Amino acid sequence: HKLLVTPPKALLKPLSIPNQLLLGPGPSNLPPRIMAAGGLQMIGSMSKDMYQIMDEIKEGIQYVFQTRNPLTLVISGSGHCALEAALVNVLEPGDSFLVGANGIWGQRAVDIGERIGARVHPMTKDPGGHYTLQEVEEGLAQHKPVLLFLTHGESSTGVLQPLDGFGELCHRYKCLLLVDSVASLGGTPLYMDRQGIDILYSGSQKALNAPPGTSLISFSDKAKKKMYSRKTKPFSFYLDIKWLANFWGCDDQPRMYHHTIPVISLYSLRESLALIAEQGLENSWRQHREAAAYLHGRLQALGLQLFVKDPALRLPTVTTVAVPAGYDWRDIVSYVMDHFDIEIMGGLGPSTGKVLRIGLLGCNATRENVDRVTEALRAALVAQA
Amino acid sequence: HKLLVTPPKALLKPLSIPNQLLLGPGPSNLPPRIMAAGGLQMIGSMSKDMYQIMDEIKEGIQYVFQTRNPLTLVISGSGHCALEAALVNVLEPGDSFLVGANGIWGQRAVDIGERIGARVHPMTKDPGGHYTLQEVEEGLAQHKPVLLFLTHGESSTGVLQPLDGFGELCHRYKCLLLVDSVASLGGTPLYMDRQGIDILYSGSQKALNAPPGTSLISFSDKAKKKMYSRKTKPFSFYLDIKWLANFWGCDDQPRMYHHTIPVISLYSLRESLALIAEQGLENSWRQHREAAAYLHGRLQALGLQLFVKDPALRLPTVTTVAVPAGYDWRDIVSYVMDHFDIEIMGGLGPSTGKVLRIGLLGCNATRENVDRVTEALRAALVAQA
Ligand SMILES: *Cc1c(COP(=O)(O)O)cnc(C)c1O
Ligand SMILES: *Cc1c(COP(=O)(O)O)cnc(C)c1O
């Protein structure tokens, strides 16, 4: 008859959150305008006003990606979900899939690729490494892939992968180019159409300063053709691009219900795109470049060594710092939080144990935050020694 | 250096949202506590405080589902995503999958099951219908399925599916029972462990009144055994239950990074679970029961016919009304919004073109809202006559 479970006592207490200055690889703190959007009332998930907001967002993604691609929309899930959406739609079982495995993101692309039946060909590199035109051309020639995955901003290694020329190279081998720009978008130069990128995705919670939970994606016509001529439906319904394209107003059919979009998250994402449209892409790139240069100079002043030696290969948004020999990286991370309420991170995937990671993301990429994190790091290094 | 795309003027003006009373089948309006939570600052997505909030949310789901299942968590996606996560983990290609296709939710389960290689066996019924024990047992004996899908609250048809005895019946046939309670949860009686349900899922944006974008799921040990003994990996990484289980603290291993959870959406979901824990499940059921009964009487007074004839079979949270002959249902929906700022909906799937749908969800299930939607309908009806 009765009730097994009683009302949880923890839930009868008010929600409270600590104040944390998030200076790791993401998510980032939210500016007032984004927080305000997140506190708004609901509207209809298929209403004319919702559709107008979705249209503005689409124009915003096209601006930040620098693309005129009609097939451009928001994925209702985190950065992983956008990657998975690209892969389950583009790749059919048996398809040759070339992957830049130079950190955790390439490792994740390999995993998803394998799960959906692709024949995966990793080009494996030690963390800190990047791919040359010559290396990719070799992979293209040897493996004849339908798709190449490359990470633009390798947030696990602090590496900025050059993108010029890779798209045209892929196209000469009849291969599509997929680029992960979750950590790079808004913080470094990126020009989707100019660079011949076929699939580009990013996430909301990095330099955009929106809450985590949504991601951005765009597909060239070459990519669309592959996704719309499959012999088999994608393994996913939730991420089926034909349904999503339709609902996001990317085709000539009336929008049909697919899934309920995250209405409130889209308010916030809209405002994040408004903030960078107001700032200007190039102005944002300059902000991050300068903030990163300031950070690097101060880190080296403390006698720390940047994990990526070539300044031209350093990702401005996420800086990897080699962990000083004899020092405990966990205790540095703990000290920084316990005494300054600042979050930084260690490594991720192959960079685990090797590095500290410091993020400079959007409105949080400031000289003041650089001073705050370097003051924290200094105190942690001293208490240790 | 030539930017293809200039900043979108649409984003260079303020975000504009209308004030709408949402009395369709969801999403519903947000109460003040839930809006307030949505406006908070970020914390670290893998911080101890975030983990504590996740633990409290988990206790909340165990309360609303009435289960002690350790494998209970939030899916980082809408209601569709929770359904897909259940199917992609439980079903291997070749598995027999029996489906109660008596509305759009069963049809969606067929679609997903087909995509992931299951041998799908629909028990098809006209909209308005529900399954008896005998019908299900007949399907079980015939198709010997590993899994049965049943919709609890059929929100496309207004039907409340009986659940007593179905779990016990499935287990006798060595079949797992999966139940969609997106529309029913919090609105009508439901007891996961007591009713022998193996997989139960719901959504954030129906009776809970949280923003759409997250969903709730729980798995019995029997369901766990299947997911953890399959010889093939699920087609999805983003929805892989072994990774999600671990990050959500359901394992005996330390939490490993999988994907970034939607931190802000979780503040809101936590608060929505807190509101219903304070009210009490039985009180919530009573509230919905009463509002619905009051709604049914006022609809019939206008000369309107309830689509579901048997009151015992009516879903309190979503009421289907037959479109009255002579009238344009589209114009009724439009009139109600244009003049009264209220959203109602037409049909969905097999009920498309046949019904109007009126939702009474959580704190919005009130006599006041019934009066408002009924006055709006009355004006709409008179206007067309
Ligand atoms: C709304 C609903 C769903 C789907 O939820 P989404 O969040 O729109 O994906 C599934 N089942 C039922 C019964 C629903 O009412
Ligand atoms: C953070 C990140 C991801 C994954 O994002 P999630 O939101 O955690 O799923 C993928 N790629 C890069 C480069 C990232 O920085």
Numbering used by the authors:
A (entry chain B), B (entry chain A): 4 to 388
Q: What does the report in the manuscript say about this coordinate set?
A:
Primary hyperoxaluria type I (PH1) is an autosomal recessive inborn error of metabolism caused by mutations in the AGXT gene, coding for the enzyme alanine-glyoxylate aminotransferase (AGT). AGT catalyzes the transamination of L-alanine to pyruvate and glyoxylate to glycine in the presence of pyridoxal 5′-phosphate (PLP) as cofactor. AGT homodimer has each protomer folded into a large N-terminal domain, a smaller C-terminal domain and a 22 amino acid long unstructured N-terminal tail that grabs the other subunit within the dimer. AGXT has two polymorphic variants, the most frequent (“wild-type”; AGT WT) called the major allele (haplotype) and a less common polymorphic variant called the minor allele (referred to as AGT LM) which appears in 20% of control subjects and 46% of PH1 patients.
The crystal structure of p.I340M has been determined at an unprecedented 1.9 Å resolution to improve our modeling efforts on PH1 causing mutants. The minor allele shows two single amino acid substitutions (p.P11L and p.I340M) among other genomic changes. The P11L and I340M polymorphisms are found in the dimer interface. P11L is expected to produce steric clashes with residues from the other subunit, which would explain the reduced stability and foldability of p.P11L, while I340M establishes several new favorable interactions hence explaining the stabilization observed for p.I340M, and the partial compensation of P11L destabilizing effect when they both occur in cis (i.e. the minor allele). Regarding the polymorphic variants, p.P11L and LM are kinetically destabilizing, while p.I340M enhances AGT kinetic stability compared to the WT protein, either in the apo- or the holo-form. The mutations analyzed on the minor allele occur in locations far from the dimerization interface, and with the exception of H83R, none of them are found near the active site. Modeling of Arg83 predicts a loss of interactions with PLP and the appearance of repulsions with surrounding residues, likely affecting the orientation of PLP (and/or PMP), which could explain the low catalytic activity, altered PLP/PMP binding mode and low stability as holo-protein of H83R. A295T, P319L and A368T substitutions are found in the vicinity of the domain:domain interface of AGT monomer, and cause an increase in the size of the side chain. Interestingly, these three mutations show more pronounced apo-AGT destabilization and deleterious effects in CHO cells (as total and soluble AGT protein levels) as closer the substitution is to the domain interface (P319L>A295T≥A368T), suggesting that a fine tuning of interactions in AGT domain:domain interface may be important for apo AGT kinetic stability and intracellular stability and foldability.
